[PDB]
Subunit: 302 residues, 6 copies
């Protein structure tokens, strides 16, 4: 819905947005939204996500896909009406994203998902990428472990010529839906095959906001291997604007720069990570706030 | 409809167009068109806007979407007939835009929406853009507040990987329709995701005229930072010709140039704004008439 | 239909074409075709024009749109049959353009629409364009007034972010149809939004011939963007879709008018001076040379 | 159909092909094929041509369009079966082109259509084109007159912003069909608007063979005005390979080079024309065999 | 179907493939496959080829097109099932190409179609092409005559602005189907108009294998004289990989180089031809074994 | 399905992935998955693969295509539901790939398919490619023989102008399905014709994972044309759609083998020598080092 503001209520929102990342307890937003999801009546649609064609499939609070749901209308606070109808497995009426209000008056946040090694990490989508020798798959799994902390992290596998990997996009979004409904920390290997169908475009534009509204983090690897002007700019756009955070490799092997958006038109934060390998190529991130401007960001985006 | 003119009636129109921006009371056009909207019979379609596919959804005066409306014909002054029919939520007959006459004989106006810091601002669409370090989201909200004045301004959120943001285009146009039906000052964050489907193209071409006819201002942020020849020229065209005003960043951080179209084939006006940040990144525009030619405009249009 | 010629009847046509522009009374062709239109039986289709999709809508002599019309066949002089049928608002059978013969044996003309300041102006489409500081919207309205003379000129508004402007292409062609059925002098602001759907392409290719056959003039502004696809389409429309061309020059206020006088005839050029009065109203100052194709192509660069 | 050959019967064909251009009486082939057309039973389809969509409309021997025709099968000499069926104005079964055998065993010819000023001219399509100041519309009409000789030549008008011009492609092909069924010499002004829909592509590939099989000549003007690599190469291909002859302007104003294909894999012939203008821009070709190689042809094709 | 191999049975195949070109009697494969075709039951589909749309039309052993054929299933040796069904003139089930096994265990062959002037020529598709002054149409007819020897060669005409030429693609493939069902030596003039619809793409990819499996040769002219990067690379690909042999003109007028694939991953053979013209432009090839590497091939492929 | 991990269970997986390539008995994974396939109930769908259109055909354990199969739902361990339905030969519900779990908890492996000449070879897809004089078809057959060892290898033929070759894509995928259901070592000649329809794109993205999950190896030849669109698609398929890469070098007869050993594991390189015998039969001469991404990208240029 839309929101009305004056000087006073806008200052309150900016202060609440600041708190969502800087002062709130790591993972609290996730716990809150779980409660919201739990309070929903049984079989009521909570989430819809786009399939390859651009149609959308719909899920309830138990990550069960809904085949049939009679049309129902909900009048929101602003006066706008939300209609939802599902027929033969697909959304007849409604929109893509959260079909129930997870956020209320609190929007444009970057809720804090976890803290690790003296740094706070944002929910939403984190894109792991860059050129050079530093490996992306070992990094996503190490971050997934670290930010999961006490909790296990979920791995969604997609589009690699290795054993057990799904290559069907429609199963991919079904995995992603379920992961976001049930887990705070999610890893995606890999995002290469989506980078084009309507579903693939829908996902790039939908997932960061879906994740941020849930308070979960989706950590996807994206190898920018191609030299093609069409596809390489789509990697830059997804890295710059479709993602909530960006983890990118550097000149020095093992080293990475993390770029975090802290909220709606707020300062973007940067820090550096050191890493090293153990047995069977398991990566560990070494444990032991500065802002970045847009000219620094565009320089890094190469 | 079409309008017939001679030397005498054309001079009258140019003089009335001048008044709409230069002399009329800020926000008066908006108040007028509200009255017009209020006088419409209940459930009668007043506005239609295009969805992703290029179909269109339709609304009444209370920003309520219309599912069913029997075909009805209205004979305008020029002799042209307007037909409107809605079936299963979508427009079967009719056009995109205002389905009732908000403007009458007064066309090509650029109605003054507000005054702030010694400068008058136009209704229609304002595109906020440019390259460099100066931030666009803090600027749209500051302008939204300033031009709202005594009134609150409405925020439509779209296509950012942050909490509570809608990313479905069909909900976006539903938010925009409602905002324009009910508020003088509107902010859009952000216009990146529309910049391509028929709906997205329809919106770029429809919104400025919709806004200007209502006497409300839509203030949209558009980051041009990507470097593809296809998409960058579409940002220039939208900035040059789809927008009623243009707010663009400069070399000096915090500083912006405002370029305003004052009316149908009238002089384009430029002025400069200074800004600074307060607590939690809230931007304030500092408080305390010159024309710009097309070669100056094209020079500025490079970013 | 098709026309058969020998040396003698071809010389007659060239002489009649010469007269249509050079010697006939300004506006006489328009008056003639009005009479033709008036003589048509009531509700009989006279004009069809293409909508966004490439379908076409149809009108009668009173600029009223026709929803239903039973199939009817007309055998022309050459033996060719013209069939017209309208169903549910759209043309089922027939063609785009004038559905009744306005021209007879007299074709490839550039009928003279008006005279002003010692120069004759052609009916058909006039494209107003060029780069630099000289303004196009003030010029189309000044020309519209001047060529209207004793008569008012009709303004069709399209695709500008200003109050009261239509942005729906289907209403645009409905305005244009009506203007051409009822007025000698027509202004279009602006042609930028058509410059792509089938309707938009149909209009660029249809309007000059529609106008020239009626003996009315359509004066459209077209601001010429730096994309190779779109810029060449502006050159083609300026070179070959238009009957006349009005283009700005180095000196502010000054314009060159390039007029096609008929089917494979000499193209004529002259110069205009202009200045502004109050509320930005433009006046054209009151007080025959041919142009070759190498001069034309030189001028066509902007 | 297909044709079987040995050394002896192939030499006979080459000798008969030589005769079709070099020794046969000008216009004889046209007279022959008229007789063939006349001998066909009434209402039997003789010609089908493609409309904008790629569907095709069909005609009988009197250039009357056929709405309905029951499926009929004809067993040719080679054993191949030709099926023709027309329903609701369009071809349900059959092919584009001549639906009856005009040529028999005699194929790959360039039948001589006329003789004028000491030179023989081929039937098929003649494309008139080139850059520079020499005008194309005056030239097509002068050639149309000259090659028509005792007979009038037919003019098909298409896609110019002048009075009486059709701009609907479906009417254009209906005019062309009729012209070819009833006249030896045909002029087309202009071919710019086809140069893209399936019909337009079909026409470029169909018309030369249709014309050559009838023994009529279609003389089309094509202004190569565009500077676009996509469209300019399509003008070169149409000029090189879709046309039977090529008339192209030169450096010297008034002067043209005619390039004629004399038959299936035969020598291409070149000659030069002088021209000048009279009253109301009527062009006269001045009255008072050499082969061209492929490297000379490609040089000229610029 | 698929084929299983070990070292021993693979060596046998390579030796049999060698024989198909090098030692077998010229035209013997064609005679064999005729016998196979003759043994088929009446009206049973033997060949399907793609039309402009990508649908396919089907023929029997007498080159008669089939309108109706009830679904029938055939279990091959490998266990795979071939289903064929024709309805309303078009293939409802089945594939493009030979609908009956012409080849059995002997695959990847390159069967010898004829011998002329001390050189053996392969069945399959021969593309005649190149730039310069040497003419392609006189060459295809001369080769057609020479390789036909005692037998007449069939000419399929397509897409030239000359008398009696078909320009409809659907008739073209009907001519080609019939020619391949009934003749060892076939000429196509010209392949320019296919060089894009699904049928045209299907044909480029289907014809060489169809011809090679029959043991007939299709000799097509392809003028590459146009200069567009999209279309010129498609001429190179068709010349390099869609054709079984390649005949290409050289610097010296009248002279041509023939490049022959002798079999599945075997050595490619090159030789040179001299030619001259007689009466009414009839070309004669003058009468009285070396391998070419891929770098030599790619060098030659530039035109 | 998705998999949950902590530090401990992730280390176990990496150790199991290491074993799948490095320590497990060559071909053991293939033998296991055969057993799995054998245990399936008769006529139950086990594999679906995409046809030219993007629809998919489905097979059972005996490589017999399924025309009809009533909708059936299977609840997996993670809670996700797999639905399969086949109607009129095509998949109505379900996904592309293995329709039964071949891999369980063990995913992202590169199961060892064979050992030959002191080196271990991975299942999945091996792309054989490169520029220069070294021949690809003789190499795929030599590798097919060598890795087959005691077992015969299956050859799928596609898109060459030679006798007995299929050129229909729908038969190609039917051959591939069957080969993978029944054989450990598979050769494909050739992959040029797929390199574009939805099926062709689906296959490039599906085959490596299908093969790796089965524990069979598909060895395809791909000759790399000088078009920027198509050449980058060859690089992407070589870099990321394939499990291993065999590429020719400067020295004739010599090849470099690049092997992915598992999910985000070290890529291994070794060199092969070859020579020809009689009738062009190639023999690979009988008698671990890692490669970095900058070395890989250097090699990827051809
Ligand atoms: N023990 C070890 N020591 C150093 N580097 C290692 C390692 N194990 C794995 N890596 C690194 O991890 C990389 C593999 O991860 P990525 O960079 O994501 C490419 P990928 O995922 O294997 O395939 P892709 O290119 O298709 O995505 C290897 O190239 C290697 O540099
Ligand atoms: N306290 C502060 N001081 C200086 N600049 C600030 C600030 N708070 C916010 N900003 C500026 O606000 C900008 C954020 O808005 P923008 O960059 O214009 C659009 P966005 O929110 O980054 O979406 P995008 O990344 O998809 O473009 C930053 O570039 C930053 O420079
Ligand atoms: N009084 C005045 N003095 C000088 N120039 C004037 C003027 N009034 C108007 N103009 C010129 O006329 C121009 C307006 O017409 P145009 O620019 O050609 C159409 P536009 O308003 O830019 O809409 P567009 O987006 O379709 O181009 C202005 O740029 C201005 O320079
Ligand atoms: N009396 C005369 N003397 C010399 N040249 C003349 C002439 N009358 C006509 N022409 C020539 O004929 C030309 C017109 O024919 P074309 O070259 O075919 C262009 P067009 O047909 O007028 O428009 P197009 O460019 O849309 O096809 C003029 O440009 C002029 O050069
Ligand atoms: N008597 C003769 N002497 C020399 N060359 C001859 C000849 N007769 C014919 N030719 C050659 O045969 C060629 C004609 O065939 P090609 O050019 O290869 C295909 P085409 O018939 O021209 O169709 P295209 O123009 O669509 O390519 C001419 O280029 C010409 O050089
Ligand atoms: N006895 C031999 N000695 C040397 N080289 C041989 C040979 N036998 C075969 N070759 C080489 O192997 C190559 C054949 O395999 P490739 O070229 O890689 C596939 P192709 O036959 O060109 O079909 P393609 O069109 O799919 O590329 C020949 O170019 C040849 O150089």
């Amino acid at each position: 819905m839309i929101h009305l503001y004056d000087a006073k209520s806008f200052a309150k929102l900016r202060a609440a947005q600041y708190a969502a990342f800087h002062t709130d307890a790591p993972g609290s937003w996730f716990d809150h939204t779980s409660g919201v999801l739990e309070s929903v009546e049984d079989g009521t649609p909570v989430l819809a996500i786009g399939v390859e064609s651009g149609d959308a499939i719909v899920f309830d609070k138990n990550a069960q896909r809904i085949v049939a749901y009679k049309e129902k209308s909900v009048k929101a606070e602003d006066g706008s009406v939300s209609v939802v109808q599902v027929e033969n497995g697909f959304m007849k009426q409604g929109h893509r994203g959260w079909l129930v209000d997870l956020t209320g008056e609190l929007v444009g946040c970057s809720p804090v998902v976890a803290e690790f090694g003296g740094h706070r990490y944002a929910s939403g989508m984190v894109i792991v990428t860059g050129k050079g020798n530093s490996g992306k798959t070992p990094l996503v799994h190490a971050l997934g472990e670290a930010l999961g902390g006490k909790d296990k992290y979920a791995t969604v596998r997609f589009g690699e010529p290795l054993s057990g990997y799904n290559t069907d996009f429609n199963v991919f979004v079904d995995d992603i839906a379920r992961a976001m409904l049930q887990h705070r920390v999610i890893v995606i290997d890999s995002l290469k095959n989506v980078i084009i169908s309507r579903g693939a475009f829908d996902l790039l534009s939908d997932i960061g906001a879906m994740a941020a509204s849930r308070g979960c983090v989706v950590i996807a690897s994206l190898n920018p291997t191609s030299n093609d002007d069409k596809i390489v700019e789509l990697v830059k756009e997804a890295s710059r604007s479709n993602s909530t955070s960006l983890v990118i490799s550097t000149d020095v092997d093992g080293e990475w720069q993390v770029l975090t958006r802290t909220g709606e038109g707020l300062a973007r934060l940067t820090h550096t990570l050191q890493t090293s390998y153990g047995e069977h190529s398991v990566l560990t991130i070494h444990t032991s706030q500065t802002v970045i401007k847009n000219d620094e960001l565009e320089s890094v985006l190469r």
